[PDB]
Amino acid sequence: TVRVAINGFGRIGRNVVRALYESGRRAEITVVAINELADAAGMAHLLKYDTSHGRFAWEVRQERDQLFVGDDAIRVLHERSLQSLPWRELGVDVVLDCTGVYGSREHGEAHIAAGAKKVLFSHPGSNDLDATVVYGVNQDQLRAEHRIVSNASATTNSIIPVIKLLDDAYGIESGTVTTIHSAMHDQQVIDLRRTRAASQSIIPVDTKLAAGITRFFPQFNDRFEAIAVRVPTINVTAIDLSVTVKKPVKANEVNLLLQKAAQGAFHGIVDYTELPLVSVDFNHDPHSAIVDGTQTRVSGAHLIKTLVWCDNEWGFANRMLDTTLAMATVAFR
Template sequence: MSSSLRIAINGYGRIGRCFLRALYESPLKNTLQIVSINEPADLATIAYLSRFDSTHGVFPGKIEIGADCLIVDGRKIGVTHACVPEEVDWKGIGVDLLIECSGCYTQRQDFDRFVEAGCERLLISQPGRSAQDVDLTVVYGINHGELGRDQRIVSNASCTTNAVVPVLDQLHRAFGIGHVFLTTLHSVMNDQPLIDGYHHSDLRRTRSAMQSMIPVGTGLAQGVERFLPQLAGRVQAKAIRVPILNVSAIDVVVELGCDATAREINLLLSEAAAAQPGLIAYSVDPHASIDFSHNPHSVIVDGSQTRINGPRFANLLLWFDNEWGYANRMLDVANYWSKRFR
């Protein structure tokens, strides 16, 4: 393991734990090594939530507790409990890449604190506040080839951007796109209370996550336009949280630039799925959302739901596991990027 990429995770919540589990369920566990986790929670709770997960099941390997460390399948992972970047000796740990999953940081000045504290590079599990707050925002399969030695701070975009951009890219290349409206039906998140309770800024998110469908704000339109700038000003989006634990969907309404049939759209996307295995999937089976829990694809196109209204007005339904699919794309980006900067 001496030549392995040394990875640390900062913030060991849903995505942090899924990233660790995805690595240990992947052949990449032999080339990427998690050496450190920084999470304010106590070690016993960290170990327990690593072993048992209400969504993804029991960890398939062995997890033990050592002296200030987790022992995962016999490998020690040091655990610290700092609340700010400067309180961890990242340089002493010898971190090649930090997976920043706390969700607490969105601006370059905050990301720079990790670099100054000894982290050579950061891969962030959310978009930066603006494109300028990071060196590159990546959707794997679209622009990961731009990763190189010069970047220090890279965003893995959002789970919804990873799901919809590959599909819109295919549609735009084949038919052209006039306008797009996206409605995300997203599973609940941990910024919502189980029963009505206070929220720091959004009155709708004071309401019980498990009793209502709740509209929330979304930056998906801006995320799409970062990757498809030719659609700038022509993308609108809204998001509704729905009371399920995992798996989300995007209802896509798109005005095409030329005439197309539902069959032509489905053929295009099924061929894209065959050309990009592991990223895009395609199905016409009568699905429910639970079918895609623990699915590693960025997006699954539900061809049974493709509709055309008039020659150029199309409606599609896209599924994605907003936790597992996203964590696997972070793993892909970490692996690809490491080959460019090492």
């Protein structure tokens, strides 16, 4: 198995661990250690119980410096600084850094200096990492020397594959995006709105989505913008993409294109549906994106609107494991 360590055991790190067992990736990957500055009993407790994701089905036990998931023993560490992480002794092939605080090149090099062979950050990080992977779009650009990698973000994983599809087919000239985030989620991007009363408002929030799009597709500088709101919902996100395109199109053609991708080159990554569903129906769906084809529109012939769903935690948590495996694989090429 690929031996992995997780640095950080908040929502992302705990979901990565849940996704490892639930998805059967446990046949390819073993979590050997988890590092977090908190009580191990508290870690076992939050691993087991979750608002969004239900009770975890595997037996969870904790004793001394071990967390047990089924018969698997995972070492629990509490190290404040990266320099003293015992990654040589654990034989770590990839460290999945889920802290959301570490994310530079220097941080990745600290993990490597501590003995991890490779680092994968659960967010965009600084702009001098080795590679950013959006699984399904560019994982085949990974090289063995890409030792510090970003996995992008949930919302960029969600919409980049759709931007890619429509650009290749139709030629995007410009685009604009709105994300409707669930209110529970901790920090997609970085405020006098945050300190407000409970009013159950729709709350404008700062988005890094356009920066991530234009980092991925620098031919889209000066051509892409994004806004975002938080609403008091139950864990699924909607992304509302509007793009102008060179090639003339009708909605029915756009849906066909997206439906073929879902059933073909993007199977497991982009899904497509025309069922009368609501956001909660995508709760715990491992896809990066589910295109809601009842909502596709073309204004005239050149302004495409498409609405895409994602479980902002579960999709990204499974991508972290897909990317991990693609790194461990290229390492052995």
